[PDB]
Write a protein that binds this ligand. Structure first.
Ligand SMILES: Nc1ncnc2c1ncn2[C@@H]1O[C@H](COP(=O)(O)OP(=O)(O)OP(=O)(O)O)[C@@H](O)[C@H]1O
Ligand SMILES: [Mg+2]
Ligand code: NI
Ligand code: NI
Ligand code: NI
Length: 383
């Protein structure tokens, strides 16, 4: 009745710790929500271990109190520039004419047994499709009849050391790390429906530093990618354009920003403190949107031409390649006004801002786009 699951993300602008309770119908009951503005981490990783330990424990302490429980283990969200993916294929004999569960384990281990690059470590082994004698597109093949079976898997890889620092901070707080999970995978478990997965969809988590991408076609995970340019780059463009402190460029962006310059009133204006003991700067909301907008299109175009690069790859191998469900933009930096209409002009398909699904309890606090990554760590963990 009461085996909890805890998800922890040490983001670049936030440290989210959520305690969830899994219910009989698969829905996760959110009973604790902890948060802390991130500290001690720069554009690379950890630059002060004791600094992030303070902020990690602060979020854990907040979640521990809200749920009246004692956290002992977590599912740590992992991201970063050096995440990569591989698509492999295996093959194994359907002995006994009937598919055993051991056969699926054997054929998945066969496909993943390829030669992974030096200094690279396999993080996730996700089967995507099975084939039993000319019949493809199979997801649950156990119990069926056949002679030869082929399996296709998605291999998410990382580096041997790119998570060593954040694992210490969690352990320094007296916590076990149950599993490292790619943020894009966890984000896809929160905002994506199985209807959207079959129809073909791509989920993009726009955080403060990274852009975690996952593309699903035919109900199968086909692509994962991190792009290390997110909300902080938009801020630095505002601080650069108007000569402002980066802390007040982040403030004017959250309160007055807009990724679409066509929907801003002409005479709305916001004051801006300048750098170097110089006076305020009274720009206009539409002019400010004229700086935010082209940064968002350039970022989403980096994602668009990787989808296009993926579709042509999938289209040639006879695999479902069209994204009919569209794009789901989640994450904290996805809450800017006019982003959906702005992202529509880049992908030329339907776009929607996604929030975590299949949760109860404290949805008021957790059903936010900047919680999709850490809520998905709960959805993954209960399996
Ligand atoms: N209303 C808003 N408009 C524009 N940007 C916003 C808004 N609210 C938040 N952001 C941006 O969201 C970013 C942080 O989002 P989020 O909470 O998802 O980050 P994170 O999980 O710490 O980071 P990452 O996923 O990159 O590790 C910041 O860069 C901030 O500027
Ligand atoms: Mg995030
Ligand atoms: Ni590499
Ligand atoms: Ni083997
Ligand atoms: Ni086609």
């Amino acid at each position: 009745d009461r085996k909890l699951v805890v998800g922890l993300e040490i983001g670049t602008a936030k440290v989210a710790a959520l305690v969830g309770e899994v219910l009989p119908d698969g829905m996760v009951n959110i009973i604790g929500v902890g948060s802390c503005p991130s500290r001690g981490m720069d554009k690379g990783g950890v630059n002060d271990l004791e600094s992030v330990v303070k902020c990690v424990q602060r979020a854990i302490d907040q979640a521990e109190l809200m749920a009246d429980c004692q956290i002992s283990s977590v599912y740590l969200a992992l991201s970063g520039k050096h995440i990569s993916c591989q698509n492999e294929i295996g093959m194994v004999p359907i002995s006994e004419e009937e598919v055993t569960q051991e056969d699926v384990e054997n054929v998945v281990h066969t496909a993943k047994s390829v030669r992974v690059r030096d200094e690279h470590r396999v993080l996730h082994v996700i089967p995507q499709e099975y084939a039993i004698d000319y019949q493809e597109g199979i997801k649950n093949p156990v119990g069926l009849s056949g002679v030869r079976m082929q399996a296709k898997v998605h291999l998410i890889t990382c580096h041997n050391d790119m998570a060593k620092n954040i694992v210490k901070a969690v352990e320094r707080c007296g916590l076990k790390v149950d599993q490292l999970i790619f943020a894009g995978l966890a984000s896809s478990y929160s905002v994506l429906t199985e209807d959207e997965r079959e129809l073909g969809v791509c989920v993009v988590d726009i955080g403060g530093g990274t852009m975690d991408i996952a593309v699903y076609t035919g109900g199968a995970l086909r692509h994962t990618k991190v792009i290390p340019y997110a909300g902080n780059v938009v801020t630095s463009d505002i601080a650069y354009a108007f000569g402002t402190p980066p802390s007040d460029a982040e403030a004017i962006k959250v309160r007055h920003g807009c990724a679409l310059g066509s929907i801003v009133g002409k005479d709305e204006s916001v004051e801006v403190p300048s750098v170097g003991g110089r006076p305020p700067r009274s720009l206009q909301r539409q002019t400010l949107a004229e700086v935010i907008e082209p940064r968002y299109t350039e970022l989403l175009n980096l994602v668009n031409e990787e989808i296009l690069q993926l579709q042509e790859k999938l289209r040639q191998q006879g695999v479902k390649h069209h994204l009919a469900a569209g794009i789901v933009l989640t994450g904290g930096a996805a809450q800017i006004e006019g982003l959906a209409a702005c992202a529509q002009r880049v992908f030329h398909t339907q776009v929607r801002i996604g929030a975590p699904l299949n949760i109860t309890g404290l949805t008021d606090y957790a059903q936010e786009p900047y919680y999709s990554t850490a809520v998905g760590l709960l959805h993954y963990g209960k399996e």
